[PDB]
Each structure stands twice: as C-alpha cells, then as structure tokens.
Amino acid sequence: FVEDWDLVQTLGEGEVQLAVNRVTEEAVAVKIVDMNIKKEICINKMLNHENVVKFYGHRQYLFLEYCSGGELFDRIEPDIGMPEPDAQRFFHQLMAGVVYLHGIGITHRDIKPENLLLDERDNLKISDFGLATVFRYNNRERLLNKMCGTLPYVAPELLKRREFHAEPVDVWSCGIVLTAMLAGELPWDQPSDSCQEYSDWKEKKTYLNPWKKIDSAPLALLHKILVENPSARITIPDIKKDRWYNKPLKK
Numbered sequence: 001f002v003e004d005w006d007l008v009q010t011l012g013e014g015e016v017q018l019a020v021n022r023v024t025e026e027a028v029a030v031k032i033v034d035m036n037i038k039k040e041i042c043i044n045k046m047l048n049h050e051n052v053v054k055f056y057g058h059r060q061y062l063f064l065e066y067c068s069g070g071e072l073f074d075r076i077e078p079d080i081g082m083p084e085p086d087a088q089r090f091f092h093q094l095m096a097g098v099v100y101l102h103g104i105g106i107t108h109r110d111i112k113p114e115n116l117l118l119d120e121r122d123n124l125k126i127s128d129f130g131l132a133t134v135f136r137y138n139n140r141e142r143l144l145n146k147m148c149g150t151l152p153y154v155a156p157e158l159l160k161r162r163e164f165h166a167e168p169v170d171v172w173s174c175g176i177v178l179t180a181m182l183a184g185e186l187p188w189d190q191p192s193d194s195c196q197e198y199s200d201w202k203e204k205k206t207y208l209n210p211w212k213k214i215d216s217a218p219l220a221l222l223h224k225i226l227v228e229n230p231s232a233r234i235t236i237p238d239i240k241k242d243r244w245y246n247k248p249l250k251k
C-alpha cells in the first residue's frame, strides 16, 4: 500500500491536486494533464535545489514536491504588500533559485507570485516548468524568440525585439515580483509605452504609486532591475552586491 496515494483536494488551476500516501501519510502535489509534457518532465529531472520544487516522477500524473504554505501570491496584501524584512527574505530565496536555474542553463520564463510557493517553514520554492526552456547548452547560449510569460511580469524586450537573452527576462520578472511584495500593486498591465504607468516610470516619476510606497533602498534596486535595455539591466551577481539586498532587516 506504500505506493498508494489518495487525491484529497484540488490545489488550484490543467489541475494540481494534493495526494496523501495511505501508508506514510506523506504529502505530494500531483499535476494532472490531459494528453510539452515530455519537456517539462525532462527539465524537472535536472532540478535539485532547496528553492526549486522537487520532482519525484510521473505515471499524465506529475509527482512533485508539496508546498503547504501555498502561493506567495496569497501573502501579498492588496495595496500594502508585506513587511519589508519578509519581502527581502523571499527575494533572497527567489534569487537563490533563479541563480541555480540559470547556472544549469534553464530559464523559467513565467516567474510570478502564483508560481512561487511556500513550504511548511515559509521557504520559497520556484514551481511549474511548463514554460521553461534551455537557454545554455554545452556552454553555448541560445537566444530566445518565443512569446512566453504573463504580461505584467514580462520584460519589454519580448514585445520589442525578435530575439533576446533569457537571463535578463527572468531578472525583470523578479523585479516585478519585488515591486508587488513591497507595494501590493503591479506597476503596469504591460511594459509598453502605451501604458502611461510604464512611461511614468521611465520618466522617473517615483512620487507616484506604487513607487511612493517603497523605501529608497529597495527602490534603488528596482531602478537597476526595471531598466528597459536588457543589456544595461543589472545581472544577478550585481543584485547580490546591492545595498538593500545586503541590508540587515528585522520586523
């Protein structure tokens, strides 16, 4: 009966259910797909990091690490965000996971609070590799060209360029996640000049929301992350040297 699992509840939406082993009572998340899939499983097989959802196997039923703390999305209070020290810790963990992925040549392509999960100790784990892809193989980088992601979190170069580097796109989405955590608000519907909010940011009108709600230190980091030119955008190694990133915080 050790291999017997009970589907006890739907975790959300294409469906993710919580499964409990009838013997050990161990919990796991089961991604059910009707019946791209082969790629997801393959990519999942390469993953082994504390801030990345673990893959156990597949029977389609993808057996993955269950995160009891739910989505980071649910820890963000509308119009408020969350305490700065909590945001910083989640950000550190997100960067750790992203550094790991980039280190193995994998780009997530859809980083957003709905995909960042929390374990029993509120440790952040990057989930869902359904849109992920290889951007580096045999030490050679491949440029991306496919439209992937979620508008409010997507980097501007996806909409303006035929080809673009993978890493700066994930960095940008991490910057939008940080903004959400600190302001409880997404800055724009999409990173296009047609969105007044995006133009306002490029004109540095930081006296407006959501920027006005964010302290100068993390805001200085956002100024380096949310840079339109991906080639001028801060890289992860430099984010790790940022003043706010290294600021001791405590509630």
Ligand SMILES: Cc1cc(Nc2cc([C@@H]3CCCNC3)nc3c(-c4cnn(C)c4)cnn23)sn1
Residues within 6 Å of the ligand: 011, 012, 013, 016, 029, 031, 053, 064, 065, 066, 067, 068, 069, 070, 071, 114, 115, 117, 127, 128, 129
């Ligand atoms: C208390 C509690 C815990 C939850 N836990 C929970 C929620 C969700 C949602 C489902 C809807 C989309 N956003 C993520 N996905 C997962 C996964 C998981 C692992 N790999 N993948 C692909 C998903 C593991 N736990 N988990 S939800 N409520």
